[PDB]
Design an enzyme around this catalytic site. Sequence first.
Site, PDB file in Angstrom:
ATOM      1  N   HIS A 191       0.826  -1.181   0.000  1.00  0.00           N
ATOM      2  CA  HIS A 191       0.000   0.000   0.000  1.00  0.00           C
ATOM      3  C   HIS A 191       0.865   1.237   0.000  1.00  0.00           C
ATOM      4  CE1 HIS A 191       1.014   0.740   4.102  1.00  0.00           C
ATOM      5  NE2 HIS A 191      -0.037   1.487   4.384  1.00  0.00           N
ATOM      6  N   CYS A 200       3.912   5.558   5.298  1.00  0.00           N
ATOM      7  CA  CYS A 200       4.096   4.358   6.085  1.00  0.00           C
ATOM      8  C   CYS A 200       5.585   4.023   6.096  1.00  0.00           C
ATOM      9  CB  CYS A 200       3.309   3.204   5.498  1.00  0.00           C
ATOM     10  SG  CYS A 200       3.224   1.763   6.561  1.00  0.00           S
ATOM     11  N   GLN A 253      -6.638  -2.779  10.141  1.00  0.00           N
ATOM     12  CA  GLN A 253      -7.825  -1.956  10.242  1.00  0.00           C
ATOM     13  C   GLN A 253      -8.839  -2.456   9.225  1.00  0.00           C
ATOM     14  OE1 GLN A 253      -7.374   2.218  11.396  1.00  0.00           O
ATOM     15  NE2 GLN A 253      -5.251   2.100  10.675  1.00  0.00           N
ATOM     16  N   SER A 280      -5.501   5.762   9.953  1.00  0.00           N
ATOM     17  CA  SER A 280      -4.143   6.159   9.571  1.00  0.00           C
ATOM     18  C   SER A 280      -4.170   7.268   8.515  1.00  0.00           C
ATOM     19  CB  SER A 280      -3.337   4.965   9.058  1.00  0.00           C
ATOM     20  OG  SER A 280      -3.263   3.927  10.019  1.00  0.00           O
ATOM     21  N   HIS A 340      -5.403   5.178   1.805  1.00  0.00           N
ATOM     22  CA  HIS A 340      -4.540   4.138   1.253  1.00  0.00           C
ATOM     23  C   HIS A 340      -4.806   3.891  -0.231  1.00  0.00           C
ATOM     24  CE1 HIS A 340      -4.533   3.576   5.525  1.00  0.00           C
ATOM     25  NE2 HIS A 340      -3.724   2.538   5.497  1.00  0.00           N
TER      26      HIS A 340
END
Length: 153
Positions: free
Chosen positions: A49, A103, A121, A144, A147
């Site tokens: 991702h 990330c 998640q 977060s 994505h």
Amino acid sequence: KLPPGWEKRMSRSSGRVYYANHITNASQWERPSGGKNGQGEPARVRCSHLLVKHSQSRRPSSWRQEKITRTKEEALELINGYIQKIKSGEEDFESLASQFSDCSSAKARGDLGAFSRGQMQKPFEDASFALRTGEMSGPVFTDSGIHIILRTE
């Protein structure tokens, strides 16, 4: 017909008869795949991702910048940009992930290794598990940030 999450739709612009998925936010002109009620769903999948975080992300900080200040809206525009570059072949997923992902998995071309239901998640997980090997998601939202998921296995 049509695998989990895929609905036919009609886009403005023209007689956009296209296909969209409400789990992954993928869209495309082409019909998804084939006569085998299921395929099931693997116990495990492997995904990469590219994460773009924003001011409302559970951690407004990344290896790329200590204080992230972009808005959910700005981050969403960035995801769309990368999705455009990726879908056009101008840049590939791994390349943009290495360069721009918020990330720490950036340094792994974005690879997160294999995982099960329960570990990530839920929207990420639901999207990852609704993709098929080779497929990429649209913008997927989590605590977060936003994505782009590529399913590798």
